[PDB]
Write a protein that binds this DNA or RNA. Structure first.
Lengths: 184, 220, 109, 104
RNA sequence: GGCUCUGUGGCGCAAUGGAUAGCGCAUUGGACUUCUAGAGAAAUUCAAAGGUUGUGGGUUCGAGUCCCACCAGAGUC
């Protein structure tokens, strides 16, 4: 059981051997936010600590792999507090359900802010593989404007990616629809 | 040495094969990544500056004369040399100081949980500050006499910078999260008025990714 | 409304004169307020369904699922995943085609 | 209801020496060209936006950072920077690259 | 009028260990993806340049690395 330090709504991993066991065994990545001791004047390659998304932290917590601790005692993520204000929101639950559903299938996942989406879906390790999809999380009853779908389709065509639409049904199962440009 | 390796050695792939040739490049790329996170810094004791953290007052005060970084960072009061918590954290992570606390040495950890707090600077602001500082910019604090937080000078002004009379900054920034609503017209107008005659830049942080957008008025 | 029939006629004219399709027929579905241009691009080949739509309208996800189910029912060929195309037109007869399917099955642009 | 807004936008951009055309393939409303002979085939891409005079407004486009990022990324090959028009204020949005602006 | 700190390719900086001066961003040249020339942000990615180490003296088997003078500029009493 590896240790994760959660405090003020951020999850950081400091050990260099717990990061290795996360990537190979559970297929969860992350973004490094520190500065390299060797080259601390650049912005290309960074070092420890490693930043975990809230969905990743919850997934590690539930399935019994790591123990969440407060800033120096075990922490409970099922009650809203100052160290965990993520409990009791619709968007966070939506994103967590979609993340878990896609993770169970065997995909790698990452952030897609620059590409106008929610997640990036990989066929394998982000090293040695191009991303295939740009996933968007939509509530089942929301209305999607048509002017904001053409831009997504054009960006996907220009970057060679496909757009995914995700909307979890109240039965605990998620349905996916694929959109792409067709030339005729 | 001084050269650093490349993340993926060459162009990436499109579809997995599982043909034992795609499973060797992956191993070679993976084993060269954790050889880099395990490295730790070391410095001679003859070029370290000591300092002490004072949470009661809210500064970091030096006990030795400062070095080359004094031309752009720090502030002097009552004859002593003092630093802001974010400047102190950047200097510690860069390795220019040897911060203590009640005669007890500190680490890079157990100091992210003393200086990074809602009372002092936050996490996103420190991220943007260090991102700009590693590129050679001069980053300062915005004194009025979402809110404007920093003053940024270009990298050409470092050589002859003067702390007492710096002049007109290149721009000034307001740090924001990525999943938060876009400000309306009134907020942007008030921010433009408060900034003055200099450009305003919006910094968005998305789980460790920073992008900047500039909002200009009066196209024609 | 005349918008749907006008856009359907524009799409039919485009598919005839420009894309040169044959035996394109208009079938009505007076339950979802939609018009399907079930035609045949090449003689002795598979069928297709086109749902014209102006840029003013907006689509949810339940509507998309219902449209795929209706298209599968019309095709009556439970051998391929549900799919249909969407046509968007403007006042100066500019049409853009996007194809919507089911599942992932699509690593291309 | 948007026909009137489009009409005022077209008339306002028609009075000057700009010929406007509709752009549907880029997610915007209009594309402003200039001059008779072609110079760049594109000068601006305008997103028409309407707000009310109480600092809240009824927005037909729920703009956020993701949508703005996607629009800016798309509107680079066929325009010369995005343009937000308010019904008049003309706010122009562009991308600031951090490693290309540290020296002149 | 003293005291403290600083001077290296176009810019920011290393050379800690006595070396022989090289990392990053810019500039240049290639290979790919895409659009109606152009653009490229984990759809992007490789290679290469180059320079009185501020100006003179001594010590150095040996000087960016030690001592003095001179020039320039940033704080403080």
């Amino acid at each position: 059981m590896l240790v994760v330090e959660v405090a003020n709504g951020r999850s950081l991993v400091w050990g260099a051997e717990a990061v290795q066991a996360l990537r190979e065994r559970l297929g969860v990545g992350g973004r490094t936010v520190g500065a390299l001791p060797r080259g601390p004047r650049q912005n290309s390659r960074l070092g420890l600590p490693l930043l975990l998304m809230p969905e990743e932290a919850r997934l590690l917590a539930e399935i019994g792999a790591v123990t969440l601790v407060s800033a120096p005692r075990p922490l409970d993520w099922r009650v809203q507090s100052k160290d965990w204000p993520h409990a009791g929101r619709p968007a966070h639950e939506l994103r967590y359900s979609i993340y878990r559903d896609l993770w169970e299938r065997g995909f790698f996942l990452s952030a897609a802010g620059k590409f106008g989406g929610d997640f990036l879906v990989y066929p394998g390790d982000p090293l040695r593989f191009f991303a295939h999809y740009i996933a968007q999380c939509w509530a089942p009853e929301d209305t999607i404007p048509l002017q904001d779908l053409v831009a997504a389709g054009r960006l996907g065509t220009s970057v060679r990616k496909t757009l995914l639409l995700c909307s979890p049904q109240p039965d605990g199962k998620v349905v996916y629809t694929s959109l792409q440009w067709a030339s005729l | 040495s001084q050269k650093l390796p490349q993340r993926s050695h060459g162009p990436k792939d499109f579809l997995p094969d599982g043909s034992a040739a795609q499973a060797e490049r992956l191993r070679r790329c993976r084993e060269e990544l954790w050889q880099l996170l395990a490295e730790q810094r070391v410095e001679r004791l003859g070029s370290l500056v000591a300092a002490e953290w004072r949470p009661e007052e809210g500064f970091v005060e030096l006990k030795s004369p400062a070095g080359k970084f004094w031309q752009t960072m720090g502030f002097s009061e009552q004859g002593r040399q003092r630093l802001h918590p974010e400047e102190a954290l950047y200097l510690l992570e860069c390795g220019s100081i040897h911060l203590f606390h009640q005669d007890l040495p500190l680490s890079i950890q157990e100091a992210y949980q003393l200086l990074l707090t809602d009372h002092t600077v936050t996490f996103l602001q420190y991220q943007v500050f260090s991102h700009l500082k590693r590129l050679g910019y001069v980053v300062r604090r915005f004194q009025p006499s979402l809110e404007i937080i920093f003053d940024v000078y270009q990298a050409d002004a470092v050589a002859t910078f003067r702390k007492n009379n710096p002049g007109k900054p290149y721009a000034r920034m307001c740090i924001s999260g990525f999943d938060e609503p876009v400000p309306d017209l009134c907020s942007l107008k008030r921010l433009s008025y408060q900034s003055g005659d200099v450009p305003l830049i919006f910094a968005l942080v998305d789980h460790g990714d920073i992008s900047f957008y500039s909002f200009r008025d009066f196209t024609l | 409304d005349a918008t749907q029939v006008y856009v359907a006629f524009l799409v039919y004219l485009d598919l005839m004169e420009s894309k040169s399709w044959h035996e394109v027929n208009c079938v009505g579905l007076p339950e979802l307020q939609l018009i399907c241009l079930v035609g045949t691009e090449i003689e002795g080949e598979g069928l297709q369904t086109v749902v014209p739509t102006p840029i003013t309208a907006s689509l949810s996800h339940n509507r998309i699922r219902e449209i795929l189910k209706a298209s599968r029912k019309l095709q009556g060929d439970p051998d391929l995943p549900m799919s249909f195309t969407l046509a968007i037109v403007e006042s100066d007869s500019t049409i853009v085609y996007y194809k919507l399917t089911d599942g992932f099955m699509l690593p291309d642009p | 209801p948007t026909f009137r807004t489009t009409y005022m936008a077209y008339h306002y951009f028609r009075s000057k020496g700009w010929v406007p055309k509709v752009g549907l393939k880029y997610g915007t409303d209009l594309l402003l060209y200039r001059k008779g002979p072609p110079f760049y085939f594109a000068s601006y891409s305008v997103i028409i936006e309407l707000v009310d005079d109480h600092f809240e407004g009824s927005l037909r486009r729920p703009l956020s950072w993701k949508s703005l990022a996607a629009l800016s990324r798309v509107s680079v090959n066929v325009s010369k920077e995005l343009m937000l028009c308010y019904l008049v204020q003309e706010v122009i949005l562009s991308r600031w690259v951090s490693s290309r602006e540290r020296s002149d």
